[PDB]
Every structure is written in structure tokens, then in C-alpha cells.
Write a protein that binds this ligand. Structure first.
Ligand SMILES: CC(=O)N[C@@H]1[C@@H](O)[C@H](O)[C@@H](CO)O[C@H]1O
Ligand SMILES: *[C@@H]1O[C@H](CO)[C@@H](O)[C@H](O)[C@H]1NC(C)=O
Lengths: 50, 265, 107, 49, 122, 49, 147, 49, 53, 106
């Protein structure tokens, strides 16, 4: 079975969804994003000091 | 003065309290500054210090003397050997009990220093000292002449006014120098004629309060295993927040605050 | 170095008795009073110079004054007859020295 | 990233791609004392007194 | 409880060396000093020396030099006192001294051994 | 005003409870896991609690 | 210098270093693609079937958190687990699954922004209609985002 | 932090209403002291302006 | 190293409003930002007692 | 760190006087910018001290009866850590990461 859902990217808030089939019991899916990271690729151009 | 003023201060001992900036680093100074009051007008401040003033190490009045606790021993220095400064050198007017009346300029901190044997003892604390002019002319150094106006200044009298501070029972102070090591065995030798509560956690807990001369605890192998608190509890101490508290009923009396703020011209 | 002690004492039953020990380095040392019943090993009766161990009868007491130490028995019974020694150390805190012993006499 | 599955107990989860391409860091950033600044620093060999 | 067991009484001709063993157990035996004490019949107790069983360090009396030699082993946890050059005056009872209680050190020595009797053959 | 402070009550390998407040703006707090360090070495032989 | 990015970043991003990261940015949405094997799925016969269920809103405040409780009276065929869900966006359910017995009442915590909520609570098989009234909450300002 | 932060009915009265945001902080490691935090005295602030 | 800890701000809540009453002992930095697309960050140095809505 | 001979000493400053190298204990050497400075340690040509903010720094000592002093107009700076501007380090607070001239000569 294939599902395509979409959830808000709000950390610390659980998100609940249900899957329904013609002849099967509904099933619950819970997703809790504890931490969402954004890591850019960085190149060290240079270093400056006194 | 006689002994009327010192009747309650002869039952007290100086203490060693933590200083955040003491010559090199933060340590336990004999002249740790507890409070600096600068609410008077003409640049007069009243410090509260761990050391004691007006009386000698034996407990008898000496005119201008600072007695300080040093690792359990009350030692002495003349008051002219002690230096005070906030941003420029201060001048010590007098000292009574735990308190010192000095004449200081304005500064963001205050530093007290003295050298006794070879080392320099210093305590610098970040207590703001304020200079408050009198009247409607904002001077910084008091004028040589002018007109007399009413003002509040920290008086140069140590008489008993209504203000008091509490004297409490000193908490037991730990001394690791007592615990020496005979051959693979700790040994506690308390100071001559003084008890020492040995609290020890080798194989089998040990609580040996009443040791007076020596005692070898052969169950222990290393000195760092367990402690020997020094029990004196004969002279009472100010209720400082930089000292441990003794269990039970602790209050023992009242010490009057000298150099209180008073009216003058 | 030696801890002097009287040879023997005689005290009637139901009467307190003193045993005295002396030494040069005594004021800076702890006295341990040892009682020995003839025929077997001694048993400690006083330690820490002032207070008896657990199980020892309460009639025993000890005190130290100056360079002397005294062990007092309140109401001596017949079973209190035995060797009584004062134990301490040398003035250099390296040599253990026992007392001569007192032959307490109970009637 | 849209490409990578995660698998567990026969279940496949393909998270992504993110809806928005917005990022806090701009093209040129400066790290100092554990803090990041959006600074338009000069290029190497183009510094100024 | 704590047990200190020594060898039985035996007789040696003067001029030989007497060997007395003292097994000990029942406490935190890592650091406890065992004292050898000699008592003549009806005379004063005489402290000869002590041995640190855990470490192995030994100490003897001032007037016990060379003639006395104490030692121990870790496996048997027993002192192995040796006294060479016996004399007629050496006829006495020997005791081991160690403390049952939980303070340790000088003087405090609760439980003793039964002792070994040394004499000269009749 | 003058902020008065009682001398800290330190307990090694133990726990304490706050006394009820009875003084102007008085308040108490028990800090666990302290290792006090007096002038004569460490006050407690007890690493935590 | 001016304040760092940890103090001036939009969307509440938290800036960290080693590596240089931005954490917990409240922007965008994550699309999830699920491929679930049929082993986890259970037939309708195996699961309990709900009957005679009525929903009552014994308490509702339209606060950010779960400020509502709904009590449903149920007479189920058998005990089991129900995937309780609201297909509509009127309410958000704290519990994605609820235990079910033969007969009784079940409580569900929900959060709604509607002053007069009316939604279709979906349980194992039934579609109960739940209605009521909600009231403004005490707190003007709270320390959590709206669920 | 304002005039009347501490209040006494008379000079000699034994009552005192105090409200200064006195807050106790955790002691520094290895230090015996009572770290506190409170608003600066309201009487001094009133005297300033 | 040990840095000071400013007195706790006195916070009053109103409908979509927060009023902070601040009594610093040292010149203290107050930084503020909206958790939205436009942070509108404010960065102020406060020496005297202040009330900021 | 070492005397005129060239042997390690505890806290000693050695200086050149008109061709000959002399020594003086470090506790006789004083330093100040606008208020007295406290010397932590010394090693080689370098001296670690604790100084308040000032516009110049002066180093003095006294050998026999002549005071050797040297004052230079190098600004001395005090840098508070964090977002509270203090001029003297607090007695208590919270621990924050900073960079300090370490008291080691490695
Ligand atoms: C060394 C010394 O002076 N000790 C004395 C002695 O009287 C005794 O040990 C104790 C009373 O318990 O008082 C103390
Ligand atoms: C807004 O500020 C004023 C003073 O500037 C204050 O009186 C008021 O209480 C503040 N608003 C709220 C909601 O507290």
C-alpha cells in the first residue's frame, strides 16, 4: 500500500494521520519531529585575526 | 571606649572567607569583604570585613590593630599596614569589630591589601562606591570653604545605637593538614588542646568526634579518603554566607554596628 | 621509657578501686586499659582513654589528669580480679609500651 | 532529500523534498566565537585597511 | 567474628630458632597491623613488635635487634614470626594482637589469639 | 534594604528539606550535587549527593 | 559586529556551529511517502467494530494546547485498539489510538480553534458526530505554539 | 526596584513588607556562598531621580 | 568564566502584548525577535530601569 | 623565570643594567594602568598580569634608592563576557565560554 502525506515542519509537535482501506482496519501513523536541521555546505574562504 | 563597646566583640573570632579576586585568582582570604556601604555624603564608606578591629589576637584592646584568622590562627597587624583603594587610595579613619570606617573616592570596586610575612594578601570585590555631593553644586572633592549645609555622614563614633548584627555558633571548618600518613595508615593529630571530628569512609564508616591528642586509623590507606573537621566552637562568629552552618540552635547574641550614619553639617 | 604503675592494690567487695598509671609522654598519648584473666588471653576493658567498649560492665571508668591516668571500678565484685595494664606508646610514637600491672585484691 | 528511503519492518519512508528552499545563511558567512554572522567579507587578496 | 589461630605449644632447646605461625581472618584485612606480644608466667606483658600484614612493613622493639625476625605470606594470610637464639628466660606465652572493632590503630586491639607456650625440656 | 543571608547548611552524602518561610521576602533552596571546598581542602568526602 | 544569526534569524531558527547548522526552523512542509506492507494491516473482521456511540463535549476551551475533552459512549463488539481520527481540520487529536472495551465511555483530548465546534470523529469503523461550545482560555500569552 | 519596594509601618515597627524579586541562584562549583539576584534598591533609584 | 545574571524581568501579559519591566544592575543587552518571516529584531542596551512593551 | 647566572628560579626578574645582568624578586616589581595591577606570572620576555582598563601601562621597581619606571601609551582593555557589561568580574553568575590568557608557559 502506498500513501503520500504532508506534515508541517514544526519541531516538537506530533502529527497524526489515519490510513483507510476498502477491506482492512484503519491504521494510525504518528510522526514527531524532535529536531529538524539545515546544514549548508561551506567552503573556508579564509581566516582573519589580529 | 573602655571595654563597654567591646564587651560583645571579645566573644568573637575572625574568619577566612572566599574572595573572588585575591592577588592571584580566587581563594580564601583573611580579609574577605562582606559589604560596603556608601550611602553617606562626603565620600565616607563603612566596610564589613572578615577580619576584626580594635582588639588583639589575645582578645585585649589594642588601639589601631587588625587581627585576622589565618588557617585557624588569629594573627595581628597594625592598622597603618593595611591599604584600601577603589580607584584611588582610600584613607582608613577607624575600625571597630568587623567594621571599618574609611574615606574613599568613587569607584566600581574596592580592594584591600596588606603584607605580613612575605606574601601579599589582597581582596578585591565589585561593590560600587559612590561619592554623594551635598547641596546643589556637584563637586567631586569636598571644597576648602563655602557655606555649611546639613548632611548625613558615617560618624566616627563606635557607640551602641539601635542597629545590631547577629553572632552565631561557628560551623566546623575542615582542615586537611591534620590528616597525615604514617606507613600506609592515616593519622589525625588535632591542634594542641583542641578536638577534631574525624568523619571517615574507609571500610566501615568512622565518626570519631572525641580525639584530642593523636589517633591512627589503620583501616585507611590514603589521606584523601576521609576528612578531619576542626572543632573549636568556643568563639562565636558573624552569620556570614561564606561559612558553613552549625547544626541546632545557632544564634548566640547581638553585635552593635558602629559608625552609623548620622546628622551633621 | 617506662610507664610506672603500683604493684598491687587491695579493696573490699562493693567498694570503688583506683588503678594509677604514669608516663612522661602520657599527656599527648591515649591510655588503653587491658584486663587479663589468668589462663587465657587479655580482654580490652577501656579504649580511647575515656570510654569502655560495648558489653563491658558499666562500673568501669577512666580519666586522665596531667601526666597521670586513673581507672576506677565502682563496686568491685569477685570476678574483677585479673591483670590490669595501661598501654601507650613511646614519646616518639613508634614503640608500644605496656604497664607493669596491678593485682587488684577482692575479698 | 527526495532520493533516499529509510526502511524498517518492511515499511519504506521517503521524506522530502522540502517545500521551501529558504535558508538563514546567505552566500558569504563569518564564524567567530561559535556564532555565525551574515557578513559580506572581502575576497581573498581584496582586503582593505 | 574474627579468628586468630596459632600453632600448638612446643619445646625447643636454647640456642635454636623458634617458628610461630599466626593465621588471621574476619575483617578488612587489607590494612591491619598484627602485634606479637610475649608474657612471662606471672610477669609483665612485653611488646616485641608488629607487622603490617597487607603491606609487609615490620617494626621491632628497641632491645629486639637481629634476634627477632617476623614475616608473613599473602596466600595463607598468616604471620610467620621467627625468634633465633632461644634462652632459658625466653620461656613464655606468645600472643597475637589485632582489633575486632572499627577504629583501628594504637591500643585498640580487641581479639587476641590463644598463644604459643615456649619452654625448655625437663 | 539589606539582603540578609543565612550561612549555607551543607550535608555530605545526604539530602535536606526547605524550612517554611517566616521572614520578609524570605526564600530557601536546596542545591544538590555541590562539592564545597573550604580553605582546609574539600569540605565533603562525597563526590555527589 | 551586530547581533549574530542566533538573535536575528527568521522563522525562529537556532544557529549552531561545528557543523554550521540551523535547527528547528518553523518554515515549509515535509512530504512523506509511505510504503506499508500488508502484514501490518488487519481485516475488518479481526478488528473490533463500533456500535451505539455518542459524543459529548463535556469541556472545551479554544486554547493553543489540547483544551477540549470529548466523551464517547460506546457499545463495541469486542475489546481492541481504535485509530481515532478527525478527517476534518476542525480539531487535532492528542491520541492517535484509543483502547476499546465491550461497553463503556472513552475520553479523547482534542484541541480546536472553533468557538462552536462540530466535527466527525472517526473511530474503528463508526463516524460519530460531535458538537458543543468552547470558551476563551485564561492565559493571554503562553509558551507553546498552537497545536 | 521602585520607591516603597520595602515598607515598614513605622521606623520602630517589627513588620516589614518586602518585594524585591529576590531570587536564589546555584552556587559556583567548589564555593561556599549564597548567590542571589534581586532588583536594585528602589529607595536609591528614587533618590537618583 | 563566570558572567553575571541580570535580575528576572517583570512580565505582564495582555491581549497580544507583553510588557517587560527591567531593573538592571549593569548595562544589559535586551535582544528581541519575532518567530515569523520578518523577525523585526530589536537590540538595545539598557542601563536605567525601563518598561518595554 | 631565572636569575642572572642562568639557573631556574621561582619568581625572579633579571634585567640588564649598563652591561651587567642583575636580578630582583618579582614581588618588588609593580605594575599599574590606572589602578594597581596584579602580576600572575612571568616567563622569558613575557609577563602575565591582571590589569584594569587604562590608556597606558607603567612598570616600576626600586633597586637601591633609584626608582626604575617605564610607562607606555598602549591601551589596556577590559572585555566583558556575555551580554551584561561589567567592569569588575562578578562574584557569582553563570558559566560562559571565554578566551583568557592562560596561566601556562607550554
Ligand atoms: C590533650 C588534652 O588536653 N586533653 C584534654 C583531656 O582532659 C581530655 O582528653 C578531654 C576530656 O574529654 O579534654 C581535653
Ligand atoms: C505599555 O507600556 C505602558 C507604559 O509605557 C504601561 O503602562 C502598560 O502597562 C504597557 N502595556 C501593558 C499591556 O502592560
Amino acid at each position: 500500500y502506498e500513501h503520500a502525506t504532508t506534515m508541517p515542519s514544526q519541531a516538537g509537535i506530533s502529527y497524526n494521520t489515519i490510513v483507510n482501506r476498502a477491506g482492512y482496519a484503519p491504521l494510525p501513523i504518528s510522526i514527531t519531529p524532535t529536531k529538524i536541521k539545515l546544514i549548508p555546505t561551506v567552503n573556508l574562504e579564509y581566516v582573519t585575526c589580529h | 571606649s573602655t571595654e563597654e563597646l567591646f564587651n560583645e566583640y571579645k566573644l568573637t573570632r575572625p574568619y577566612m572567607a572566599r574572595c573572588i579576586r585575591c592577588a592571584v585568582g580566587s581563594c580564601h582570604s583573611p580579609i574577605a569583604i562582606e559589604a560596603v556601604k556608601s550611602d553617606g555624603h562626603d565620600g565616607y564608606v563603612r566596610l564589613q570585613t572578615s577580619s576584626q578591629y580594635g582588639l588583639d589576637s589575645s582578645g585585649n584592646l589594642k588601639g589601631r590593630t587588625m587581627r585576622y584568622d589565618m588557617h585557624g590562627t588569629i594573627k595581628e597587624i597594625p592598622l597603618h599596614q593595611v591599604s584600601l583603594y577603589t580607584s584611588r587610595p582610600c584613607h582608613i579613619v577607624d575600625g571597630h569589630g568587623y567594621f571599618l570606617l574609611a574615606r574613599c573616592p568613587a569607584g566600581d570596586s574596592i580592594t584591600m591589601e596588606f603584607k605580613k610575612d612575605s606574601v601579599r594578601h589582597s581582596c578585591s570585590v565589585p561593590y560600587e562606591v559612590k561619592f554623594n555631593p551635598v547641596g546643589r553644586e556637584l563637586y567631586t572633592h569636598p571644597p576648602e570653604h563655602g557655606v555649611e549645609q546639613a548632611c548625613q555622614v558615617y560618624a566616627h563614633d563606635a557607640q551602641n545605637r539601635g542597629a545590631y548584627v547577629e553572632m552565631h555558633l561557628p560551623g566546623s571548618e575542615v582542615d586537611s593538614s591534620l590528616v597525615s600518613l604514617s606507613g600506609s595508615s592515616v593519622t589525625v593529630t588535632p591542634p594542641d588542646g583542641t578536638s577534631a571530628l574525624v568523619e571517615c569512609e574507609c571500610g566501615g564508616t568512622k565518626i570519631s568526634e572525641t580525639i584530642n591528642k593523636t589517633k591512627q586509623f589503620s583501616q585507611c590507606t590514603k589521606k584523601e579518603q576521609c576528612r578531619a573537621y576542626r572543632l573549636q566552637n568556643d568563639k562565636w562568629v558573624y552569620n556570614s554566607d561564606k561559612l558553613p552552618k552549625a547544626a541546632g540552635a545557632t544564634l548566640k547574641g547581638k553585635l552593635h554596628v558602629p559608625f552609623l550614619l548620622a546628622d551633621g553639617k | 621509657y617506662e610507664l610506672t604503675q603500683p604493684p598491687s592494690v587491695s579493696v573490699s567487695p562493693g567498694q570503688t578501686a583506683r588503678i594509677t598509671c604514669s608516663g612522661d609522654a602520657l599527656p599527648k598519648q591515649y591510655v588503653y586499659w587491658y584486663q587479663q584473666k589468668p589462663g587465657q588471653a587479655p580482654v580490652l576493658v577501656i579504649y580511647k582513654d575515656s570510654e569502655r567498649p560495648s558489653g563491658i560492665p558499666e562500673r568501669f571508668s577512666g580519666s586522665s589528669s596531667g601526666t597521670t591516668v586513673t581507672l576506677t571500678i565502682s563496686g568491685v565484685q569477685a570476678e574483677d580480679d585479673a591483670d590490669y595494664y595501661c598501654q601507650a606508646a613511646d614519646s616518639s610514637n613508634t614503640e608500644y609500651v605496656f604497664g607493669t600491672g596491678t593485682k587488684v585484691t577482692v575479698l | 532529500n527526495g532520493e533516499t528511503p529509510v526502511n524498517f519492518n518492511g515499511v519504506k519512508i521517503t521524506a522530502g523534498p522540502l517545500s521551501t528552499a529558504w535558508t538563514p545563511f546567505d552566500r558569504k558567512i563569518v564564524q567567530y566565537a561559535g556564532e555565525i554572522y551574515n557578513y559580506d567579507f572581502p575576497e581573498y587578496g581584496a582586503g582593505q585597511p | 567474628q574474627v579468628q586468630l589461630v596459632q600453632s600448638g605449644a612446643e619445646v625447643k632447646k636454647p640456642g635454636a630458632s623458634v617458628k610461630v605461625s599466626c593465621k588471621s581472618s574476619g575483617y578488612t584485612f587489607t590494612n591491619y597491623i598484627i602485634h606479637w606480644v610475649r608474657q612471662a608466667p606471672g610477669q609483665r606483658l612485653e611488646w616485641m613488635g608488629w607487622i603490617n600484614a597487607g603491606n609487609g612493613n615490620t617494626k621491632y622493639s628497641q632491645k629486639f635487634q637481629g634476634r627477632i625476625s617476623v614475616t608473613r605470606d599473602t596466600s595463607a594470610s598468616a604471620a610467620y614470626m621467627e625468634l633465633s637464639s632461644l634462652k632459658s628466660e625466653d620461656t613464655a606465652l606468645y600472643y597475637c594482637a589485632t582489633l575486632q572493632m572499627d577504629y583501628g590503630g594504637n591500643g585498640d586491639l580487641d581479639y587476641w589469639g590463644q598463644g604459643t607456650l615456649v619452654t625448655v625440656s625437663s | 534594604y539589606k539582603t540578609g543571608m543565612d550561612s549555607p547548611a551543607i550535608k555530605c552524602c545526604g539530602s535536606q528539606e526547605c524550612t517554611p518561610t517566616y521572614r520578609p521576602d524570605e526564600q530557601c533552596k536546596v542545591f544538590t550535587g555541590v562539592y564545597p571546598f573550604m580553605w582546609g581542602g574539600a569540605y565533603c568526602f562525597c563526590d555527589t549527593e | 559586529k551586530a547581533p549574530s544569526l542566533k538573535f536575528t534569524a527568521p522563522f525562529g531558527c537556532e544557529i549552531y556551529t561545528n557543523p554550521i547548522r540551523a535547527e528547528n526552523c518553523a518554515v515549509g512542509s515535509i512530504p512523506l511517502a509511505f510504503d506499508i506492507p500488508d502484514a501490518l494491516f488487519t481485516r475488518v473482521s479481526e478488528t473490533p467494530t463500533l456500535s451505539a456511540a455518542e459524543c459529548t463535549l463535556n469541556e472545551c476551551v479554544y486554547s493553543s494546547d489540547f483544551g477540549g475533552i470529548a466523551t464517547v459512549k460506546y457499545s463495541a463488539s469486542k475489546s481492541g485498539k481504535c485509530a481515532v481520527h478527525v478527517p476534518s481540520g476542525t480539531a487535532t487529536l492528542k491520541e492517535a489510538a484509543v483502547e476499546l472495551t465491550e461497553q463503556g465511555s472513552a475520553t479523547i483530548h482534542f484541541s480546536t480553534a472553533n468557538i462552536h465546534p462540530e466535527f466527525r470523529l472517526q473511530i474503528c469503523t463508526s463516524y460519530v458526530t460531535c458538537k458543543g461550545d468552547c470558551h476563551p482560555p485564561k492565559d493571554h500569552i503562553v509558551t507553546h505554539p498552537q497545536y | 526596584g521602585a520607591f516603597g519596594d520595602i515598607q515598614s509601618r513605622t521606623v520602630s515597627s517589627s513588620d516589614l513588607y518586602a518585594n524585591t524579586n529576590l531570587v536564589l541562584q546555584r552556587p559556583k562549583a567548589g564555593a561556599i556562598h549564597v548567590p542571589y539576584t534581586q532588583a536594585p534598591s528602589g529607595f536609591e533609584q528614587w533618590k537618583k531621580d | 568564566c563566570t558572567v553575571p545574571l541580570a535580575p528576572e524581568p517583570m512580565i505582564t501579559f495582555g491581549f497580544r502584548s507583553v510588557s517587560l519591566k527591567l531593573h538592571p544592575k549593569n548595562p544589559t543587552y535586551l535582544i528581541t525577535r519575532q518567530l515569523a518571516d520578518e523577525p523585526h529584531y530589536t537590540h538595545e542596551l539598557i542601563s536605567e530601569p525601563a518598561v518595554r512593551n
